[PDB]
Amino acid sequence: SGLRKMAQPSGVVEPCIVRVAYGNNVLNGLWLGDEVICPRHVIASDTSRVINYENELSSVRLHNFSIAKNNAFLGVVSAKYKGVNLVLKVNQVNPNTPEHKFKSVRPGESFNILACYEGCPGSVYGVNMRSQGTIKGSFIAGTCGSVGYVLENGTLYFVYMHHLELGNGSHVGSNLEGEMYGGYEDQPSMQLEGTNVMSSDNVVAFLYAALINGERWFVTNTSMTLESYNAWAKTNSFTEIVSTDAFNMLAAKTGYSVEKLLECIVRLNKGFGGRTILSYGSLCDEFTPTEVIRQMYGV
Amino acid sequence: SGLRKMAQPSGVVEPCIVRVAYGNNVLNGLWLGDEVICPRHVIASDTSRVINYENELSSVRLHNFSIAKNNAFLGVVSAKYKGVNLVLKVNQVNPNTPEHKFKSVRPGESFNILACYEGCPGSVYGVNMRSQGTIKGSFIAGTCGSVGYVLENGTLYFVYMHHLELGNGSHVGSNLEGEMYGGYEDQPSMQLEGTNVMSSDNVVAFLYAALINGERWFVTNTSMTLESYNAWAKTNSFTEIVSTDAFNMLAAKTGYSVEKLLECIVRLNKGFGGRTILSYGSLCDEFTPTEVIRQMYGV
Amino acid sequence: SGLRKMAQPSGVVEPCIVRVAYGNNVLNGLWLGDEVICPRHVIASDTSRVINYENELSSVRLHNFSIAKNNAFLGVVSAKYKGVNLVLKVNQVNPNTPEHKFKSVRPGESFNILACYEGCPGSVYGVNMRSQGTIKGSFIAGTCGSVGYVLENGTLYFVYMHHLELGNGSHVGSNLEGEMYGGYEDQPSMQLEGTNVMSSDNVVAFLYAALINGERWFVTNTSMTLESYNAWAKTNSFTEIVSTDAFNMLAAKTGYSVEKLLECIVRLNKGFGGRTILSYGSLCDEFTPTEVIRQMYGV
Amino acid sequence: SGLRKMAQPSGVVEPCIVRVAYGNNVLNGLWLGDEVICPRHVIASDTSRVINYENELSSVRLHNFSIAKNNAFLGVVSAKYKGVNLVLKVNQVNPNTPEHKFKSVRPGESFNILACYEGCPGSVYGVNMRSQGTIKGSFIAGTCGSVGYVLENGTLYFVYMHHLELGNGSHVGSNLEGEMYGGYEDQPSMQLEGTNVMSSDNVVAFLYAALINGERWFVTNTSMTLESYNAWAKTNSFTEIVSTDAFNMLAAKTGYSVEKLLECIVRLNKGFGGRTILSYGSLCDEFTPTEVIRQMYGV
């Protein structure tokens, strides 16, 4: 038993992390085949003031890049912007390039952060994409270019590269195709996060996890239909739920229907009344149905 | 968020994980050089009742082991006990044996779990050793033999191997010397954990993280001497603090002395009075000064 | 019943295949009117090293060309490039030139390969163009200049000519206007493919085919709106579906709405849980709605 | 009976329309919650020359915004781009904000325009998206920021905001994520539409509608195979027809197969020779088959 925010193993990703230096900036890049992807602000002379990315790119000389894996240096032969990412061609093919794909993550979807410092992987932890396109990712200075990945269906996906922290502390990155999540821009300017919508599927998953791990005080003799829940959700900042199908396994193993947990959400959203569920004092949407099933019953 | 539990990258450990089966038992082993270490209860014919490990070893048949590292099957040359672990001489040297050391973690110290499921690494997360020798993880059937490690100087230390779950849900394992943390026996018998002694160092770190995070409601300018606090701790199931020097960074930084925070601990131990600290409803001792320092600042 | 990746019949295409040799190089050409078209790398002295195609063309000697076909007598009169294709004017019109057009295939579209080995038609099989402009076929040494075609609306279209295989093993060719699909270079250099977007239309067709052939385990009667589905698709490297109109016959015949299949896709993309669908282990996008319809209902 | 181009009722949208004036520009905004969304060219010094939107936004004066609904003046507090849309944060939340989603419409699809004139909703009418991502509406100076919407599943979707007219008179707007349909840019530069490809599906429905109204002078006893037509279609800037859709509802209730109508399209494409069909003197592709079915029969 037990519920913890976990990350999938980082082994296959670690050999792809390199140190990218330009000028007085140092951050992290992703080395796959003969190219390195990194945040394009590594070439910005002053990341604390407004950045003219056109001018910065004209100013670039390839020989000013320093790219290193451990301390074997990789020479850059070509550089281009792709969206908010720099794509740098190097002569050396990463001999440990894993089989992989690029995709993005949706609100509610969980993924793994390999947080890196100046080319050195330092920690790994699970996060969850929020509706405004931000994560709570505990990034600090020196961690830009840190990589988010998912393992799903035996496929390694790269889904995130870290760029910046908003004023409210939320974290903003791009996918590996240079599109910033949330449409935020890679500028030190004031950018507002906005209305965060709770992932309903995840909250249902949380309550199932609660049931499996011993906690049951919140369930009553009431259940509400999926439609009625989706009506409620659309005006209380919760996602609609498409299908109960995702939880079948969880309903079967616990004997609790999705419709009962839906009613629980409506109630519990108004407070826990002092009590806690799995130590949390409020509903938590950071765990997907998949994460819960994995953790409770094996991959 | 603010303060989140992290793990260190698992890449160097993953190639050491093997699937070990004997009879109806399947768990994980640690493959280092030409040996595999795993919980000796893998050869227990019935893990639901008391086990005579002398007899079990006596009647072991070496060809009844199945040991596998993905692509590779290993043959067992000899079996012996080291404490509560089996040490199995195998016919093949692990080509990916990393540079490693062994140590035991002490109460209050954090480490990483590579949760493995019948030979396959599935997840990575951080835990903290409690005074009674237990951790609060998330282990299910199939995860015995899962490995705990720290990346330190800057080498790899193996510190934990998973064996069992107590009636109260706490998790129990051994060091790689075969000594069960907390002295629990590897038997399916009732075993009491005993009273948890909170790590004062970690709780001070917790409160610094809260202050760093802008939460001030619990502090006064009133302080408490290190000697005074330790007097209290001794009869309130909190560790005594040796010295204050480990917090100098956080102290100088927040402008709050350790002594002030000691005052907070004695007061907050009587209850949070319906407020929270970093979304917690009571004092948390799972984050070390190191963790808080690192997770907030320049490595 | 049954589902098989098929090829339209190759008879009309077979008389158009000729052997083109130059120096030690031997491959295939398409003979139409008074022109033979083939991959330009036939005139490269060493295809295992990078090629200067301007130098190679500058020093072509027309009498070094060898064109052969069992029922013809052909001399090269002239040569020039069109993109990556060599276009040879010959001194004889193909008497068996069929009515034909050139067109390019788009991502998701299926076509036929006539695989030829040094001028000799050897096999024929169906393929599907992926979003990165590659196909998964089966080409070896001697098969360059193998021709792709579609019979579409009573019309013969030539759509492909084979040039090379990427490091990852995907197959690359040009249209008959000499434009390489996916913009790859006809160089023995290292070139990366990137991530293929799955055709949602094809995946939907494939599930319909599965249903018709008695596969039912994956389907439930919960449906997902086109809108919801497309939001998911946009981030999961699937194409968005424009109208369900192309499925109306399949939906009528099976009694299953597209919306019910859209829900299946979101589920099944996470994995089959170890199960199969028509012997496949993951979702398949190589079958178009057209391919499925004429195969299941002959129209 | 009878066939008119219809709009869905506009009541749910009308309370969201506000007047947005900045400097010398006056257009319409969409007030949802605490945001007013409008075309970003409202803050351009000079809409008659190339515009530097980075600078215009850089130098934007939030107090020179005059936003009025009711006669209530909203105060701007924050401006940003979201693609080609300006998103303004305002000082009062729209109490009449309806429940809504955003989606994009695709070529061939029908949707609703609420034409607004410098802040006042003035008319509502149906449009259909053309192949190049344009519509033929009726927009003049003062109508920018007019809104397109669809009602589906009782759900309100915002799908269009009006930006400009092309040189040829075709109308161009964005979705509410600020992506301009047809990839046009919000510049007073020359921009070519591309050649318009009529939707064959929509023309069939139109002809079916005509038959139902008792107009049949244009239909003969002869037919055209689906493959003959599609061949004709590529040549004559018409889209290819996929299956027969369940034109079967129409086919059955009219007696005429699709194939008969395809022959009509080819004949009628030349011109109607003085006569008309439902008042038109040329083929109309603005009605979808679904649209026609509901309009005539109700579903």
Swiss-Prot record, chains A, B, C, D:
Site entry (Important for substrate recognition), positions: 150
Effect of residue 161 to A: Increase of 3CL-PRO activity
Active site: 41, 144
All copies of domain Peptidase C30, residue ranges: 1-299
Effect of residue 160 to A/F/G/T: Almost complete loss of 3CL-PRO activity
Effect annotated for changing residue 41 to Y/R: Complete loss of 3CL-PRO activity
Coiled coil: none
Function: Responsible for the majority of cleavages as it cleaves the C-terminus of replicase polyprotein at 11 sites. Recognizes substrates containing the core sequence [ILMVF]-Q-|-[SGACN]. Inhibited by the substrate-analog Cbz-Val-Asn-Ser-Thr-Leu-Gln-CMK. Also contains an ADP-ribose-1''-phosphate (ADRP)-binding function.
Protein name per the record: 3C-like proteinase
Organism: Feline coronavirus (strain FIPV WSU-79/1146)
First-to-last residue of the parent protein present: 2904 to 3202 of 6709
